[model samples]
Structures are given as C-alpha cells and as structure tokens.
Target: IRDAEILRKAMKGFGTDEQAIVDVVANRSNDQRQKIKAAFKTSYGKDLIKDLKSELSGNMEELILALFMPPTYYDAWSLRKAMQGAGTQERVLIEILCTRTNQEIREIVRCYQSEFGRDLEKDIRSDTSGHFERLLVSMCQGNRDENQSINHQMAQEDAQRLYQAGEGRLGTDESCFNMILATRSFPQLRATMEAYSRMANRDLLSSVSREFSGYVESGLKTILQCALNRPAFFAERLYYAMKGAGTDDSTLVRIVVTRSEIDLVQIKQMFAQMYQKTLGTMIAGDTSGDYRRLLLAIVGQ
Candidate 1:
C-alpha cells in the first residue's frame, strides 16, 4: 500500500483494489486510518490522497479521495461547494443542501467549524440572500437531522403535492417538484414516495413516466428513484446505458467512478437484492475493451 510504484500499479488499468483501500481506510478505526495515512507517506515518499487523486478521475475517483480526507476537510469542501462551481449547481445544493444523515450532517457542521473557524450555516446565511438561499440554509440548520421527526402526515401531503405537480396536474407544475424536493427531509420524502405508491396505486416512477419526458422529467425521476431505491436506481441507469448498445462511455464511467466510495457498497447490495445478481457480474456482462478492464480492476471482487 505504501510503495509509489505499487500504488501506481494498483491504480493502473483498474487493478487498484479499491476494496482493499477501503478496508485499509474505512474498515479500520479512524485512528488507524490516520496512522496508515502517515505510514503511507513515510514509506512511499508520496501523500496517499494526492497520489490517489492523480491516479483516478471522475466521480469514483473524486469520492474515493473524499473518503480519504479528514472530517474537517470534507466540511471545508462542502463550504467551498456552497459558493463555488459553475451555474450554481442547484441540485448539488439541493442534495447536500437538503438530504444527508444526521450524523453525517453533524460531522459536516463540526468539521466546517474546525476547518474554517466560522459557523458553516452562518456563512450560507451570509453569502446568499433570497428564497433559494433561505431554503438552502434552512436545511443546513440540522432540524431534519432526526429520524423521529419524519413528519408522516406532512410527508403524505408533500407526496401528494409532488404527484400533483408532476403527474396529477395538467401542464407541468415544476414548482411542486422544486419545493417538496428542495425542502423535505430525505427520510420523510422516501416515506412519502412509498405512501404515494399505495395511494396512487402506481409507483412513483410510473407517475413520472406518465407525465414527464426529456431532461426535466428524467432529472425528477432520477431523484425519486435514487432516493427511494438508491442501488436499483444506479443499477438500472448503468444497465440501460450499457446493456444493449455500445456503452455510453460517459455514463458508464460516471456510475462506476462516482459510486466507488459514496454508497456504491449500498448500491451493490441493492443490485443483488433486486436482480439476484451482483453489480460486479452485471458490469462484467455489459462492459468490454480497456475501459471495462480498468473498471473491473477498481471494482475488484
């Protein structure tokens, strides 16, 4: 794990053994990861995180590197995410802005304080002024950080609103999509979608397909599916793009690279639960050529 040549070799052509890296970093206790990181630099004369970033690319690479950073570093990045980036990256704001586990959000909050020497939420409040900023800051307040306050009654109402906005109404009311999605707690929203299926007698995806199309429709559907069934959400997305035609290189790369660290483990488990097959096997089936091999190397069963 320490030798630069070995590390480089590991990353080369997808043989990087990301699971091994994960075992080294995440599976170990936090203190151990810190020690190993130090040892990695000492032994290799290279910073492990920096080398990994240099070796990898795309979402998978980025996420894996993100995992390597200290909690404070992750917090610093989130603050940077708030105001930087192109076109405001509204959805990035929405997801990070809205949905995250309480513990994860707390980590972000504490890390922001430690790393930046300022209140992260206050920065959000200060930097932008408007309804959008208000919505974003409200989420950062960590009120939605509780599982007990899932707000079943309110979630149902929000679900109905989302359904009406996208499928229940004539002409797209996209505002419903924006408000409910941009505002509700992720746990609450998932509950709402489940209830929506029962009440509507059709699942959320069907509702979206019946009403919307193209990017707007697709984006909405992506959020709902990923939120409710994250693994199946990613699995289906990957399968469709690569199953029959020449692989969509961009998409193929995006899923594998991005999910490598963030919830891909959950995604893999979900794929097995839904399809009775491993994501690794499905990937083996769909991909060919050097790209496939590289991905397989990283995915290392």
Candidate 2:
C-alpha cells in the first residue's frame, strides 16, 4: 500500500522515481505485483496503470507496464502483435508457439480469444500463408501429445517419414514437418532425432539447416532446439539477441519478461556456459541508461 502512494507521488513529475519503480516491479513476484495493483485501487481509486502510462513513455513504459501484464495474456498479445500487420514477425511466431508447453500455449490460445477481437487460430490461419499456416494453425492447438512415451517403431518410421517427406528427396513436404514437429511428444522427438541422424547419416538439426531455407529453416530448427534443451535454446536466443552490432531490444524484452518467472536462472547459466559472459554483463554493455538498468534489475545481477 505504501508503494501505491510512493509510485503516485513519484509520477507527479519533477523527475519520476525510476529507481523505486524498477525496484518494485523487478523485485516483486507476480502475485505480489498484483497485490500492489489491487492496493492501488483501494488507496487512490485511480488506475495505477493509467498513471504509469501517463507518466512514463518509450522503453521504460513498455518494460515497466509489461510487469503488470500476466504471462499468457502477454504471450497471446505477442502472437497477435506478430501477425496483425502488413509484414508478420516470423521469430515472434516461431518462438512463442514453438517453445511453450501445452498448458502454457493452451492458456495463450484461450487468452487470445478472450483478450482480442479476432480469434488466435483463425487470425493466424488467415495471415502468413503456407509455412506459417501449418505452423500457427497446428501449434495453436496446444496439443503436443506430450504424454506419448517414445517407441522405436514410430521413431524410425517418423525419421523415415521426415527423410521421405523432404530431406532424402526433392520438392519437400511441408505438412509432414509441421504434422510431427508441431504435435509429437518431446521424448518421442528426441528418439526421432536420434534415429534420423543414424538414417540420414547427419544430425537432424544439420539436415534442417541444409535442406530448408528462410522461414522453414528457422521455424523447424526452433522446435528441434527447444525439444533438445529449453534453457540452452533460450541462451542461444539471448546471445543472438544482443550479439554483434545493434541490439534487438524487442527480442531481449520479450524473452526476458516472459521467462523471468521460469528457468531464467537456468537460461542465464547456460548463457554463461556457452558465451563466457553473464547475461547481465551482456545487457550491461549492449544497452544503456534506464532501459539497461531496468533489464539489469530484472536479471538481478
């Protein structure tokens, strides 16, 4: 409740308390954050979010207000924001739909409907055409058959199916790629990858990199990477997000905000293992001022 008043007065201008604001949003858990949200109503009867929106702008506002947004709600928005425009954001589509668990994605699917005027499945189906059509339409179902135990019969057969569908032949079959990758059990996918390497005489991921191009290459590979290891995949995400020249701040914000509650530490450790730099240090150098500080706060260096 004290935070409610502090945040209000801070936003009263004359240089807002970005420090107090960051500390509150970054240090608090999601449940505690919501408690503050409710507390704001009782004390001032003014909307805290509205006040923040009024007081803050640019990256600070986006990063701060996003903490108030729940997980699946934001996930649904990320998906919608990806496909709603003239040009779709491919990585956003691939990342959310591919990496999320069935329960998580199912919630996103539902939230998309409740939260937006257009339905998730229908909208994705209409936009992006072929590869993405197969992608979001199937993945949006949130039905990965995650319970399916690995079986040798299906593993080798699916490996053969993947090969026959595309790699070992010409004129690739995109449906086969989506059909299995989109819905097969994760454990079963590992078995398929193993069997595929044996049959194809090359790594499953390597083959996709070789045989596929553009959207297909990255989208197909993202599922394979996540199934192989989640935090490692996310580590790769953060690495490339800030790698080389300019920062992909959108990727950084999306990944950090979404994963902050789950396995963020693991992702950080993997990032350190692979890149020889802490995620915090990377962000420290890559971004600056308030945006940098807020992200550093979330990362808890």
Candidate 3:
C-alpha cells in the first residue's frame, strides 16, 4: 500500500487499521518513506508521524514510528535515547558508533546537531567517563583511514603491538587495543587481524576475548566482527537477539529496519548458515500479527 492508502486506512473509521499501518510503513524504503511523509502532509495537511503516534501504542508503535524517521535522524534519535535516563546503553553506542563508516558518522553527527541543537561529542563526554568515553569520542570524529591497500610491515607491527598489549605481557594495556581498533580502517583492521593470527599463532579475536572482559571487550569484539565481515557480524547479532529465553525485540527491530535496504539479504543468508534456520522462520516463531509480517517483509521473506 502507498502512503495515501496508509493514511486513509489509519484514519478510516473509529478504530485504526493496524495491518495497513504495518504493511505500508514496513515495506517502503527510507527514502521512499521520507517522500511519503511529505506527500501525506501535502495532501491532507496532516503530519503522518503525528497521526501514527496518536493511533498506535507499545513496542509496535515504537517500531513503526522509528521507521517513519529518516535514517540519520533515527540514528541520532537512538543515540540521544541511549544517552539519556538512568544508565548509559553502551551496547547501543558500540553497535552504532563502531560499525558506521566515516561518511556515515559524519552525516549522523550533522543530523544529531540539527535535531537536538547540542554537540554529539559533548553529550557523549557528559554521559560516559574514562577509557570508554575516549573510545566513543574517537569514533564520533569520523576520521578512520579509508585506504583499502594493505601495508604488510605496518600490519605486522600492529599485530605485534596488539599481542604485546594483551597476551604478550601480564596486565592488559586496553588503551592500545582501543586506539588501534578505533582508528584503523575496516580493511586495515582485517589485515591486522590476519597478521596477528600469524605472528601470535592464535586468532586476534581469541586473544582479545581471553585478555579483555566486560564492555570494553564487547566493544573490541564488535569492531573485530564488523571488520572481518559486516553481514556476518549482524547475522550473529540477530541470532543472539533471539537465542535466549525471551526475544530482544529492540535489537530485532533495529537490525531488520536499518539493514532492509543495505545488506539484509546477505545477513539472512549468513543467519541461515550459522543457525540452520531462516531469519523469516525465527521471526515467525518469535513475533505475532502485523509485527511479524512486517519484520519478515523487511527481510524479504
């Protein structure tokens, strides 16, 4: 269904057509949806998001409302939400800040300031302290090297530095790990990982996993996974989201929505290979009603 039909279906009668809400909002690309949001106001003088907010409730409402915002806006919004309230959601920050490319980070920073009228780095500083804070601030700078060509000598040197920092001595030097992973290009990191594996006769991930613990470990692992294979990294995240006793609906919704137009197809394939079940099948079992259908649709099931 198009946005017009979606609006009419939403406002048609006494109750809302929740199915139409899911069908239209979930199926369209973000770019297409942005156009529809404007078109909805032009045709009816109504803000589509405002209308949806009044009609829907709960996580279902959150998911659909999230879909309505432009990608950069949604990213900044998610960051803002993560930074606010009782405790910081460092996982959300690591996932977004670590995985985004340089250009993507730049755009997110721009959108964040435009939307909130606050400096992204300043908020991050206020919200977090110590090494974790420094890592996040570095990521927000959007200055990672984009060069794809490998420097074998540099890779080998970086590998030795990583090994020395973590496994080569007692008491880990977490700063070394943080600086290398935070600044290197994805391609460079992959090279570093390979070089480390050869030099140390063990995988870099294994070393990091053994040496580091807690959120810093998680952050390094995210960078490693994203560097090695982004789709598979996300596929692993999707698996974890559904693996425990209860579903991680926030993660499920975030991955499915954000990656729909990007590498979701590859992620679905990776998910099947790793888990021996289709992402669609998992979603079918975990979710219900329009919500289930919408998620499956976004994954192209």
Clashing pairs in 3: none
CA shift of 22, model 2, Å: 1.2
lDDT of 2 by residue, 175-221 (tens): 88888898788888999999998888888888787767787778889
Go through the candidates in order and give the clash count of each: 7, 0, 0
Deviating ranges (above 4 Å) for candidate 3? none
TM-score of each: 0.55, 0.94, 0.95
lDDT of 1 by residue, 1-301 (tens): 3533444456568446654444444444334556667777777687777878776666456545554555545545755665563444443444354435455667778777776677777766666555456555655666542453578888788778777776666876655665665456567768878888887888877776776654345555655665677667777766665667566654555455545656667767777787788777877777654345556665665
In terms of lDDT, model 2 sits at: 0.85
Off by over 4 Å in 1: 1-34, 42-99, 102-145, 148-176, 182-187, 194-203, 206-219, 240-266, 273-277, 285-301
Instruction: Locate the minimum summed-lDDT window of 10 residues in model 1.
Output: 21-30
lDDT of 3 by residue, 1-301 (tens): 2577666667677988887777777677898888888888888888888887787776677788878777778788889999987789998998888888888899999999988998999999999987778788988999988888888888898999999999999989988998889888888999999999888999999898899877777878988999988999899888889886778999888887777777889898988998899988888888887777677767764
Off by over 4 Å in 2: none
Give the whole-model CA lDDT for all candidates, comma-separated: 0.61, 0.85, 0.84
Alpha-carbon RMSD to native, per candidate: 6.6, 1.6, 1.6
